[PDB]
Paper text:
Peptidyl-prolyl isomerases (PPIases) catalyze intrinsically slow and often rate-limiting isomerization of prolyl-peptide bonds in unfolded or partially folded proteins, thereby speeding up the folding process and preventing misfolding.
The activity profile for peptides with alanine residues in different positions confirms the importance of W4 and F13 to the enzymatic activity in the full-length context, while removing the methionine side chain in the M8A peptide increases the enzymatic activity. In all structures, the peptide substrates are bound in the PPIase binding pocket with the proline residue in cis conformation, coordinated by the previously observed protein–peptide polar interactions, namely N35-L9, I37-L9, Y63-F11, H119-F11 and Y92-F13. On the other hand, the conformational flexibility of the residue i − 6 is also reflected in our crystal structures.While residue W4 of the original S2 peptide forms a polar interaction with the SlyD residue E60, orienting the N-terminus of the peptide outside of the binding pocket, mutant peptide residues A4 and K4 do not form this interaction and as a result, the peptide N-terminus bends towards the SlyD linker region. This resembles encounter complexes where initial contacts are unspecific and contribute to the association reaction, but not to the dissociation step where they are replaced by specific contacts. When both binding sites are fully occupied, the two domains restrict access to the PPIase domain binding site in the tight conformation.
Author numbering:
A (entry chain A): 1 to 150
B (entry chain C): 1 to 11
C (entry chain B): 2 to 15
Write the structure that this text describes.
C-alpha cells in the first residue's frame, strides 16, 4: 500500500537543521489534509510501505519564513503572577476571532517583555531521514475529524 | 502583529 | 499569517 490521499501513514524521522540534528521521533498522520508540512508530504506521496529516504525541505515549504512583524512587546502585566517569564518559555494569547495565538518569550527587560509569534523553525530549512513504517486506509471517523487518532 | 487585552496562559 | 504553524512534525500550539 502506497502513501496517498486519505491514508493514515506512520513514519519515524530524524530532523537536521544545518548540520545539527534537532529531533527524532515517530508520528502517524492523515495524508492529504494539511496535517504535515507540505514539503514532507510531497516527498512521501507514492512511497511504498518499507521505503526509506532522505528529504530536504526549504523553509518556505515547511513553517515558512520568519516574519519580522511577528516579534512584539507587551507589559509584564499580561503575564501570570505564578508564571516564570524567562527566555524560552511558551505561552498563548488571544486573537480577535477568540482563537489562541501561541508565542515564545524572547527577552524580558524590566517592565517590557518581548515575545515571538513565529514558528520556532521559521526561516530554517530542514533535512530529514524518514522511514515509512505503515500506511493504512483511514477510518471513517478519522475522515470526519480530519486527523489520525493517535 | 495582532494582540488582545487578554493575558497569556501557561504551557 | 502563520498557516503552517500547527502542522506536524513539530507543531506550534495544541
Ligand atoms: Cl493527522
Amino acid at each position: 500500500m502506497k502513501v496517498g490521499q486519505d491514508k493514515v501513514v506512520t513514519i519515524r524521522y530524524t530532523l537536521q537543521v544545518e548540520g545539527e540534528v534537532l529531533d527524532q521521533g515517530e508520528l502517524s498522520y492523515l495524508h492529504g489534509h494539511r496535517n504535515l508540512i507540505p514539503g514532507l508530504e510531497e516527498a512521501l506521496e507514492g512511497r511504498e510501505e518499507g521505503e526509506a529516504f532522505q528529504a530536504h525541505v526549504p523553509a518556505e515549504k515547511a513553517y515558512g519564513p520568519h516574519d519580522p512583524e511577528g516579534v512584539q512587546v507587551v507589559p509584564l502585566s499580561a503575564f501570570p503572577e505564578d508564571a516564570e517569564v524567562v527566555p524560552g518559555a511558551q505561552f498563548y494569547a488571544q486573537d480577535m476571532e477568540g482563537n489562541p495565538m501561541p508565542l515564545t518569550v524572547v527577552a524580558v527587560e524590566g517592565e517590557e517583555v518581548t515575545v515571538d509569534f513565529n514558528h520556532p523553525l521559521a526561516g530554517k530549512d530542514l533535512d530529514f531521514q524518514v522511514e515509512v513504517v505503515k500506511v493504512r486506509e483511514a477510518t471513517p471517523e478519522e475522515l470526519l475529524h480530519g486527523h489520525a487518532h493517535p | 502583529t495582532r494582540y488582545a487585552n487578554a493575558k497569556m496562559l501557561p504551557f
